[PDB]
Design a protein around this nucleic acid. Structure first.
Ligand code: MN
Lengths: 338, 338
DNA sequence: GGTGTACAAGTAGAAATGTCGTTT
DNA sequence: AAACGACATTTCATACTTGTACACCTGA
DNA sequence: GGTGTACAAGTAGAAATGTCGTTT
DNA sequence: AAACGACATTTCATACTTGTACACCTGA
DNA sequence: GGTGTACAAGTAGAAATGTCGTTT
DNA sequence: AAACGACATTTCATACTTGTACACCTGA
């Protein structure tokens, strides 16, 4: 019993025995029986053998012509990056499943885009670009991160749920989780740190506020802590903090200039330029997930142990990111680079 | 110039030509040089050939043993539906990447869990069960949804941006979307409806509260418009609304009383049980995406086009889902059903 | 609810053959 | 007998169709 | 900033097949 | 020469391993 | 975040006397 | 002494009006 590939094989053999198409065909018919290609099909193959080959495959058969070739659909994404298949479909005369396939065929894949801090304003942009521009220049004259003490303030929710993902067979419930309350128990952490470590931090008790007055207390307390912790700030201290309604007030301005600290220029709506946000907290967020301290002091034991178990260089890295981190902001002409 | 399979193909041929084993090797040598398998394999082949040769394949050869039974990685999931490969791997005593593949080798895929309105108390769970049980029971006796009228308030943020997702080559960047302001401008929509459509609705001026006293005023105005829009009730309106502290006041309960409306019992923390929520706003939830509202007059404008644009089918359907919900709520024991 | 995607199955052009009369 | 030349036939990966499964969103 | 999943390339047992001396 | 039978040797789809690239979260 | 209803705990009358007149 | 009426003065007893705390909407 034979096959149309195996058949071709035999004929390669029958050929290499110096045998004619005819005396080859009648072999086949006697070995296998009457259902076996035509003499004409043997003669056919013979001609191909005298050129020489293993015709492992047929050459590609006939096929429908493409209704839209690649470079066309590619030009649609070049217009607008993120349209839906249903929707490039309409522009291409073709169905949806149709579009899915070629997208799969091309190198393409869908990814969920990034969240950006806030909708920036054409001024607000020139304003960032500049600060970045200025600070960066002033950097290269003489590095000053070595001096720089920075700080911010972030909420610590008491329970931090996040949706659980389950490995299950298609069409089954994946493990579901109950919503986090928006108006739930939460403290408020404010921490100041420098390139070496964490200098001093307060944990404002549940339902707590930071007012022009409050901040000064902290500021002065920070310095109190600073004296003994960084033994000898020869080199004047450089203070980087967000333009909160509180920090921006004239009351505090006075309390700052009297400590004589330098305030580093800062841009509105720019947490992506502020070490505490994009590096220190960013770490913490991973570390806080699925966690729930039920007591205010459990938060403190956690914070205390967290900072203590942090590496030393981890902070350095954070702070030292700043320069090229600006070089980026300016390369965007005051955009959010991501 | 053969391989080991074209080799069985020639020996299947030479077999039928009544050539002996050692006979076909002589031919095999002169056709394809001294480059082929040994006599011994021909002999071997030939015994197979004598009683159903049918080499469909090399019959499966050796392999390393498995380390964990498929069904043993399974028992891990029966414990925790939602683990990470790294984490299973560990208990399996084996590599993440290893586990990665037994997951596609078995059926399993990964899906995100539901978010669920509340961590439900042992009691609150049966508070629900009952109320469902209860309503579902009178429904069994005779449908009464024909005269059930319901409402609930819900927020309409002025800007609501969705995170945009995009088709791009691997490692290329997505599209980025500017975060929503946690607390921008928002109007607060109070709406009431029955199986025939929206009865009445008000759109509260941004930052507008709804207090025991203000609610009554609405209720009344609702009823005022009810005798007009539904003259049917001149010839018992079942009111379905949530245990809101505003809707729950001594004053309101006593106001409602002398309107002579029956208030359907409605279990606390049960928004999946109240049509307004799971059906009306849910329809809205979608058609609000990417939308912007420059002024409060647009939101009026936008509300009407929508409300009037939906056919009675849509509403009737929404209310008529109630029984199959209660049916569910009951044999879930009051747990938010899937 | 409402949407978006990708599998599942269908329904349409050259090569590889087949048929048949012609050439050696 | 052997091979060819010029038709018609049959073969099958392809480019698309519709139908629809089912992940995930949506109101809380 | 940290973590989680899949693609890539590499490294470890019985069938297929080989070598040789026996048996007809 | 043809075949076997017994003992040694080569072969390959397998089941894991390192490497990884990369989509995403993370912080406002 | 909003709000409202129950049960505080704290800051606002109607009976206790207290001090006078009296007169005999 | 001994009465007993006016009416200031000093408690005890309810009608207040903030106050704490728990409930239910909900959702960075
Ligand atoms: Mn801040």
């Amino acid at each position: 019993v034979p096959n149309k590939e195996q058949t071709r094989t035999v004929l390669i053999f029958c050929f290499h025995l110096k045998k004619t198409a005819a005396e080859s065909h009648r072999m086949l018919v006697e070995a296998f029986g009457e259902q076996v290609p035509t003499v004409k099909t043997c003669e056919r193959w013979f001609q191909r053998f005298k050129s020489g080959d293993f015709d492992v495959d047929d050459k590609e058969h006939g096929k429908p012509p493409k209704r839209y070739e690649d470079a066309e659909l590619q030009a649609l994404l070049d217009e607008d990056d993120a349209q839906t298949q249903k929707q490039l479909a309409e522009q291409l005369e073709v169905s949806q499943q149709a579009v899915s396939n070629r997208l799969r065929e091309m190198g393409k894949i869908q990814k969920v885009g990034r969240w950006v801090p806030h909708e920036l304003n054409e001024r607000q942009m020139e304003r960032r670009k500049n600060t970045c521009e200025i600070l960066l220049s002033r950097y290269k004259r003489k590095s000053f991160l070595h001096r720089i003490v920075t700080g911010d303030e972030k909420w610590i929710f008491f329970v931090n749920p996040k949706r659980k993902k389950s490995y299950v067979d298609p069409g089954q419930p994946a493990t579901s989780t109950a919503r986090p309350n928006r108006f739930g128990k939460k403290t408020m952490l404010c921490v100041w740190w420098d390139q070496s470590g964490v200098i001093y931090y307060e944990l404002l008790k549940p339902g707590e506020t930071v007012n022009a007055a409050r901040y000064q207390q902290q500021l002065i307390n920070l310095n109190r802590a600073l004296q003994r912790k960084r033994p000898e700030y020869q080199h004047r201290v450089i203070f980087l903090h967000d333009n909160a309604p509180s920090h921006t007030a004239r009351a505090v301005r006075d309390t700052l200039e009297t400590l004589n600290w330098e305030v580093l220029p800062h841009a509105a709506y720019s947490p992506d330029l502020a070490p505490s946000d994009y590096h220190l907290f960013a770490s913490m967020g991973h570390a806080l997930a699925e966690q729930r301290f039920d007591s205010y002091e459990s938060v403190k034991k956690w914070l205390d142990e967290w900072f203590a178990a942090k590496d030393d260089e981890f902070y350095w890295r954070g702070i030292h990111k700043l320069p090229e981190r600006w070089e980026k902001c300016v390369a965007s002409d005051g955009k959010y680079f991501e």
